[PDB]
Amino acid sequence: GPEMVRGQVFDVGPRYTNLSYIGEGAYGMVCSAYDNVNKVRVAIKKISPFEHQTYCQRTLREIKILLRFRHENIIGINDIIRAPTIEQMKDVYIVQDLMETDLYKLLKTQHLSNDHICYFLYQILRGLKYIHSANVLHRDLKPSNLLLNTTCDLKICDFGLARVATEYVATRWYRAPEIMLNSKGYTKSIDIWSVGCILAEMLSNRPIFPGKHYLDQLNHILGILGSPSQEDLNCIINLKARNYLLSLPHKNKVPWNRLFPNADSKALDLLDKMLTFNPHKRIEVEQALAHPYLEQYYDPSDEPIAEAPFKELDDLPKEKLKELIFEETARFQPGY
Numbered sequence: 001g002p003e004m005v006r007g008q009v010f011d012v013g014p015r016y017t018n019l020s021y022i023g024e025g026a027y028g029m030v031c032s033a034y035d036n037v038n039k040v041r042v043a044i045k046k047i048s049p050f051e052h053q054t055y056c057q058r059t060l061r062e063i064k065i066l067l068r069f070r071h072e073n074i075i076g077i078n079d080i081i082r083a084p085t086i087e088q089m090k091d092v093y094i095v096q097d098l099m100e101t102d103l104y105k106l107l108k109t110q111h112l113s114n115d116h117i118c119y120f121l122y123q124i125l126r127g128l129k130y131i132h133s134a135n136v137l138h139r140d141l142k143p144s145n146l147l148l149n150t151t152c153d154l155k156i157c158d159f160g161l162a163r164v165a166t167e168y169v170a171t172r173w174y175r176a177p178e179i180m181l182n183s184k185g186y187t188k189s190i191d192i193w194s195v196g197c198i199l200a201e202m203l204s205n206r207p208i209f210p211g212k213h214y215l216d217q218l219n220h221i222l223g224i225l226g227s228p229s230q231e232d233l234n235c236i237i238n239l240k241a242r243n244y245l246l247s248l249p250h251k252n253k254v255p256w257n258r259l260f261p262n263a264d265s266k267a268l269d270l271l272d273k274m275l276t277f278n279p280h281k282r283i284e285v286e287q288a289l290a291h292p293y294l295e296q297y298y299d300p301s302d303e304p305i306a307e308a309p310f311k312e313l314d315d316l317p318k319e320k321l322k323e324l325i326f327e328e329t330a331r332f333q334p335g336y
């Protein structure tokens with residue numbers, strides 16, 4: 001019958017065999033496998049989203065975007081397996097290139113040198129430059145979706161929340177303050193904040209803004225950035241959120257070099273421009289790439305961009321979204 005892993009059906013044979021559990025997100029279970037047709041190792045993510053409108057959104061968005069992106073620092077989709085009829089389709093298997101680990105797992109075991117922080121940071125921004133050039137926001141960057149192979153190549157993954165320029169997630173320590181405040185008008189700078197948070201974690205092997213909920217999270221951010229300036233306050237669109245922040249006790253800014261006393265000063269300069277409360281003043285991806293911290297790797301001629309930008313699913317019921325997912329995956333079926 002179907003192949004099985006940890007008591008879960010992984011029906012991807014006969015082409016894909018030798019499944020080995022890797023890990024699990026909040027939505028997908030991921031295995032390595034062997035592709036007997038191309039004679040290569042792959043990863044396969046199983047998702048079962050059709051009972052939940054929000055899971056269907058995640059699935060459709062990830063498939064749609066990843067199939068149009070092609071970049072060394074972004075995971076590609078090789079193949080997609082699902083049932084030959086929509087009525088039988090309950091699971092979707094997304095076949096991707098196999099990576100060895102992710103930044104979350106690496107940081108649990110290793111303290112990175114500065115040269116490795118620069119390289120990983122550069123690869124993040126190089127992928128993000130292409131993403132943002134397509135007018136796409138990733139919106140959920142975090143260490144666990146920064147995949148790594150043995151050659152230390154880095155590929156961004158997990159585009160279920162991506163959108164052209166929310167919902168429950170397993171972590172929001174990497175979310176920009178405006179996400180927790182304004183609740184609308186999200187820009188490319190929200191990704192830059194997330195990258196700033198990842199840079200900080202690579203510098204200390206600890207998350208910079210942990211917190212049990214949004215309120216606690218904002219207190220962590222404010223406890224380091226200090227109370228928002230007048231100009232900062234004006235860039236908050238929702239007046240009730242602005243009044244909330246006005247209600248909090250005053251907080252002084254903690255100098256970055258007190259938090260990271262041994263870090264390279266160039267790294268902290270870039271971190272400061274990334275973890276800027278005001279999204280309009282936050283450094284942009286191409287400016288970050290050209291920052292002196294990254295001069296060993298910066299090479300605009302080898303930092304490609306998308307040919308052209310992309311240019312809604314919240315209203316669609318889950319039955320409509322399942323039709324759309326069936327349609328989007330037909331190109332991997334025989335007889336399309």
Ligand SMILES: Nc1ncnc2c1ncn2[C@@H]1O[C@H](COP(=O)(O)OP(=O)(O)NP(=O)(O)O)[C@@H](O)[C@H]1O
Binds near residue numbers: 024043099102147
């Ligand atoms: N192509 C891949 N190669 C190797 N490991 C992978 C690959 N894709 C995912 N993983 C691992 O599997 C984990 C879960 O993948 P992910 O795509 O984030 O699942 P998700 O449930 O859909 N979203 P999330 O809950 O945010 O993690 C990742 O954090 C990696 O550890």
Ligand SMILES: *[C@@H]1[C@@H](C(=O)OC(C)(C)C)C(=O)CC[C@]1(C)C(=O)OC
Binds near residue numbers: 115
């Ligand atoms: C990284 C070093 C390494 O072992 O990578 C990790 C797995 C620890 C991240 C190494 O062996 C020499 C230098 C590299 C390859 C590197 O990327 O330097 C820029």
